[PDB]
Design a protein around this ligand. Structure first.
Ligand SMILES: Nc1ncnc2c1ncn2[C@@H]1O[C@H](COP(=O)(O)OP(=O)(O)O)[C@@H](O)[C@H]1O
Ligand SMILES: Nc1ncnc2c1ncn2[C@@H]1O[C@H](COP(=O)(O)OP(=O)(O)O)[C@@H](O)[C@H]1O
Ligand SMILES: Nc1ncnc2c1ncn2[C@@H]1O[C@H](COP(=O)(O)OP(=O)(O)O)[C@@H](O)[C@H]1O
Ligand SMILES: Nc1ncnc2c1ncn2[C@@H]1O[C@H](COP(=O)(O)OP(=O)(O)O)[C@@H](O)[C@H]1O
Ligand SMILES: Nc1ncnc2c1ncn2[C@@H]1O[C@H](COP(=O)(O)OP(=O)(O)O)[C@@H](O)[C@H]1O
Lengths: 367, 365, 364, 367, 365
């Protein structure tokens, strides 16, 4: 009755679309959905165009543009903002040779927009290329009803206390698995390396893991995966939020925990290299928590500095297999004496480009 | 409209998923769902990962972990808990080469968790192998709406008294058969030997039978089957509960009656062996009740009173084709001089590993 | 309001199809055993996984159920046995899956009170040389979960009879989808459903089975009944065989029974038809006793002589006449051969008892 | 929201009437409501007329008529049926000098209707005038919603089992006390001797007791109490039923237990006269059952099974302090050597005139 | 949704008034007899017409009821007797109409199992010399018809505790109308209600009765409970006295009892009190049995030692302290004299048993 009752998309018919989706087209014709990051640094925008050819590379896609003043990227008279494809994926909605196109964005003068964090991240990731840095990201998120309350939670109230929902199974334990399952498979079909999923501590809260991807491709892939989550959830009338505190107080906020390695760390006795990198990471702490947050640490501080599977934003701790510590070497990695380390500081709404750039600067470029 | 009105999963669209399900993936890509028992010893948990190969046995799969502090399996600062794969099944939700994996769980130091009953059962099952013991379990369960009241029952009250609902047919006799049929088929596809189903005495109450299964297999199989029931139910917005007394008073609680035979018992003249086994089980009643419910024989006490065709919690009686009993020999087993016997004591929420072990201890060791 | 409280109507209906397309290894066979309970009117069922494709009812195992849970308590040994009698293709699962009609037997091998097949079969076998054929017109009514006829205004009545019989239209007949699904399921299963029609009462319908030789009418009508209840379950709709599912001047329900022997079907058999009707005239009370499963109590509520119906007490029979106990149809009196129509059996009759009683009187 | 949703009277505004009730008229305008029993023998009918005078006794009221063919009292084309006042009460709905009139009925030729039982009862009661016989009746009844299900019961189902509802207090114990309380007060005001009320075993079930009344007046007063019950219930959209089994099974039926005493049973040593009457009623069980029911034993046969605190229809019994019997003599009476006896046979829908006559015929006219 | 299924909430409430206002001759008197049933928790009532105005209880007729219809079955001798023991003016009917508190007796003239008044009264008269005064703080909770606390989100919880205690506002306290109506109806009836407040738990409230001399605190509290249920009823809201109307870290329910003798109150002061207290430290186990009507089984649920309550095993005494079993209020300590607080009695206690036990231990040894 109440659940999704005001959500426009949940109330529109979902069956008719298949009639039109079945329509055969000249294989020549290609619909391309260009996706980009808006002025908030948090949200995605998209639009599409018809091509008459199958592109092999993002360089073969035309440069496009949008009204930056309609996306919180105003620039007086000169608000036309340009779209530079950087990465191509198969489209799981249209399936043909139809494609999704991640972009980065440039002002009219050829300079990056404020929210373009990929330009510099790429400079750096090229300059550490020889080190073959690999990143995994654990993206947490919460499903909301249209009124902003977490999906399925009683209106004007709370479901039972945490305990039964983590990795839960059952109608009273986890909600909207359908979307999670759809999204997992859509990401796979699109060529994004999602390595798994789980249900989180808060009911309506989930996680998917992406990686491991090399260098800057973790940013393109996570951004596209976010796009896909929002877009799939839209069809259901459900809002997916990346906000780190989608509900105040005792309930679990949201991280984007980031797993890192270089070729040396992955090699035999890389443990010493890891332990070195964590030391370096462990103290420049005030500098990273700024580029782990699209508003420079104001979002972080709603979730962080507590005792709910997180990290204190105040100070810094580096433990082994410690969910309480900002940066963490897993037990099996100590045991193996090689592998990777987990940075538990990035917030669910982090920009991955900023995260990897801060990381690489510190552990490869030697600041 | 009240039925399922507040169930989130029942209020979310169900046809969109099929679009995404039919997406074709490159081969190499396998989705594996790991499943384990949590610190309650009753409830299941699960999560997924992507593999780049097709495993051939459980041994080929990666050991994995979870946070036990989030599963009622806290161990201070060392809360990481380990998932060991013990059985693979085909995945009926995702099909193809996708798989479901039953696990057992270990603490950070390599010891079993309190609710891992399989390590100790596996040991005993292995000592008893040559007697080739076979187990079947009749798992009773009940469908609930989101508010915890049994599915389709009138809000704040009761349907008609017992009688019409057992093995029923008709819109006013039995509810949500679609889940039952979907589950029977899913299990069969998964490789679980579901041997039957029926609607039970209580409206919204049902049973599926698993077996016969070789030794430790009954435990892996029944756990995975329970998983499948919860997980299929979930899509409908419906809760499946294995609680033994999901409504109080004169409403049939729930059992997990266990059928047992050894090789001796299945060969001509087995009835002698069956007779002896029943004899031994009669001198250690209390120990079995304690292993026959995962809270030491306390959820056993809200059901096993000595009424509604059942055992008594304090009292051990056996008999030939007798349902007011603990241990029963079926008429057809007696008439054939060979076969299997029925242990009626275990409750719907028993851990099958514990039931098996207790039994094999008494009648093989 | 319509079906708002029917649990099965409120549960999602599209998810099942995802699990139904699940491919299983050839040779796994699901078998659903079906039986009549201690009311003598209602059906029960459950299912088992089999190893093999049975070639005939004898190849299937004997099973059991707890009689105490279906009004068949025999104190301390209530374990009741299920003997397969007929096998049908399963229209719900298809493949090699089957439904299995049974009859039922106590612990000591004697028949339960509601097993009327045993005794009917002895009689029908004795009459086999007369090749008796039976056709049955099974009437029924769809109900909402509250017991009120489906679609009828709550706490009230739709317009008077006239427009609904064999109707077409959203305001003339209800739930044809179940009717059409049943019709085809029955044909797929191997049941000889010869026709259907909408009846005089809105939400009321009829299916005809036959002609079937002997005992097989009984098996087949029972499985068709099971199929009706079972298909209508998935819609959340109750199908009742109650003979007077609403009181007043609203059409009750019959299971009119058409009957012929070898002699009656050959030219000049009309003589033998009249012989048979005459033997049935002389023992009216024993048939009305056989013609509902409480011995003449349920038919009384229908048989008022007013609504296309015969008298409770008084036996009558005439050509072309729907006010009579036993009617000889126009076409058959004209043709000099065919069958007679027995209009006495109520919609909740056991066809084994009906067959047996008619065979005893016209063949014995 | 279902309780009373389909009941027309519950869905009509209730405060508007007050506006019109407070309209003053001159004391000499009298509204008289004539009430009678219809051809079912169970239900009441009524209608109103304006008088210009205040009658002093039933003798002073006009004899009236109605169309019996609309009340199941057809008699072909001579269907005009006559209404003779026999009792007047003060009207608790209009107050002032307005009145309710209980009547009995008579066919066009002056002979009584089949459902007029008063006539032959009053013949009898007059011959027993000396014995000064008193009657109390314990009228059980059930409130139903408009769909025929008991008021407040879950639709298509049953509330919790019996036990908590008898003389209960609490929103989840008893329902519609306002009607019970209104009616009790309205009976008193109208001039009926209502001695008490209680909530009964079945939820939605209630009882009021009337008496002790002298002779024939028990009949007139109880029929008028009945009228008032339905007429008051009607306002709330609630149906009040006197059906003896308003729900089949292990749910308590409804009786009209009748307390009886003569001058002689009330004096010292009266108990001796009592045990003699019981014995006389014990010799003719089948006579009474037929007088105890608007048919002749048909509705009793659904209530009276032996269980649920009532006598068997088949055989008779006495005892003391026993609620399983037909005729109960209270303890407090045996102990005091005087009082009355309780006939527990009459069903809730009995016609009281029929109950009284049959009892008097037996215990006074020595039949 | 709130009160949507409560029959009394859905019945028109304005019509009754046009009937109550009807006038009747002055010595027509409606009397409502009130008694405790076989649970020893719940009340029952029924009513009769008198033709006179009673001056005291003894002028009312002894009456009876069917004990087998209220869990007071004694086979075929089930008629149970009502003895009037206290009269109150009737706030629902006004005029000379009355409410009658009774105690109950078997057919043989002996007290029913749930009459604690008879023995309580014996002891009270023996301690009359020492002029004992009692004050009781009765907590209770309002429930919707489904048993969920009134106004709480269906299938869930409101915000944590903090804002509700002594709260003001539509989102802080619920159903103040019932509380005000009860407060006043009690005062009019002759019951010495001395205050009320909204409790920690949302929908939870309290009223205080007393100080009352001796046995009358039991009569008066019982009749106040009656009034609460009966007023609640007209709104279609349930009032429960269950000590833990919701599980976990939501505030249970007490019936804290304040106590004094003449000594303790007249100047002599806290040395009489400190001795009285030390007499209670001796017998905790015995008092927990007197302090709910199943003898420790319901208390165990709110007496956790957590959420401002004492633990059910261990005894404790502190000044101005709220974690203790017995309490000396700072205010009484500061002064020569006063009363002491007993914080162990549970919301569903029988006050007659609370008084008796306190009096045996303290005025009698
Ligand atoms: N050597 C590595 N370097 C970087 N990332 C890795 C490496 N190995 C694994 N990862 C990635 O880290 C992520 C692990 O997330 P998850 O399984 O949720 O870990 P946990 O929940 O134990 O913290 C996965 O995407 C995985 O692919
Ligand atoms: N020899 C045997 N040993 C163990 N289990 C058996 C044996 N034979 C059959 N079983 C299993 O016993 C179970 C019987 O379940 P069910 O038909 O519900 O029995 P009932 O309802 O009569 O107790 C099924 O799992 C069946 O496969
Ligand atoms: N000669 C016959 N002998 C036995 N049964 C017959 C014969 N002819 C027809 N039937 C059966 O009787 C049924 C006739 O029912 P129906 O056509 O509904 O009759 P009506 O038109 O009078 O309702 C058919 O379903 C058919 O199987
Ligand atoms: N002497 C008497 N003769 C006839 N009826 C009496 C006499 N004394 C009292 N009564 C009536 O008996 C009835 C008592 O009924 P009730 O109080 O319900 O008792 P119980 O609890 O035994 O059913 C009242 O109608 C009362 O007026
Ligand atoms: N001397 C006394 N002896 C017994 N009871 C008393 C005495 N003085 C006050 N009381 C009663 O104790 C109750 C106090 O309850 P309350 O005001 O809620 O106290 P608190 O909430 O501070 O514990 C009141 O009914 C009060 O009348």
């Amino acid at each position: 009755a109440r659940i999704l009752e005001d959500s426009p998309n949940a109330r529109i018919n979902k069956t008719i679309l298949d009639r039109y989706l079945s329509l055969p087209l000249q294989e020549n014709i290609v619909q391309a959905t260009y996706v980009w990051i808006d002025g908030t640094g948090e949200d995605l925008r998209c639009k599409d165009r018809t091509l008459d050819f199958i592109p092999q590379s993002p360089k073969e896609l035309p440069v496009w543009n949008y009204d930056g003043s309609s996306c919180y990227q105003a620039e007086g008279s000169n608000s036309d903002t340009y779209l530079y494809p950087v990465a191509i994926y198969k489209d799981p909605f249209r399936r043909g040779n139809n494609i999704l196109v991640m972009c980065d964005t440039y002002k009219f003068d050829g300079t990056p927009t404020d929210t373009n964090k990929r330009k510099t991240c790429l400079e750096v990731a090229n300059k550490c290329a020889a080190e073959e840095p690999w990143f995994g990201i654990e993206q947490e998120y919460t499903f909301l009803d249209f009124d902003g309350h977490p999906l399925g939670w009683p209106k004007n109230g709370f479901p039972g206390p945490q305990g039964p929902y983590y990795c839960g199974v059952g109608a009273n334990k986890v909600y909207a698995r359908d979307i999670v399952d759809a999204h997992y498979r859509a990401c796979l079909y699109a060529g994004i390396k999602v390595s798994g999923t789980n249900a989180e501590v808060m009911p309506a809260q989930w996680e998917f893991q992406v990686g491991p991807c090399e260098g800057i491709s973790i940013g393109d892939d996570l951004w596209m995966a976010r796009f896909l989550l929002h877009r799939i959830s839209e069809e259901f009338g459900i809002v997916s939020t990346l906000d780190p505190k989608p509900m105040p107080g005792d309930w679990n906020g949201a991280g984007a925990h980031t797993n890192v390695s270089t070729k040396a760390m992955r090699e035999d006795g890389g443990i010493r290299d890891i332990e070195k990198a964590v030391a370096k990471l462990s103290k420049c702490h005030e500098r990273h928590i700024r580029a782990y947050d699209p508003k420079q640490g104001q979002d972080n501080a709603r979730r962080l500095t507590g005792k709910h599977e997180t990290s204190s934003i105040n100070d810094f701790s580096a433990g082994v297999a410690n969910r309480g510590c900002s940066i963490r070497i897993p037990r099996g990695v100590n045991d193996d004496g090689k592998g990777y380390f987990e940075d538990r500081r990035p917030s669910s709404n982090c920009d991955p480009y900023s995260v990897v750039e801060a990381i690489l600067r510190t552990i490869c470029l030697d600041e």
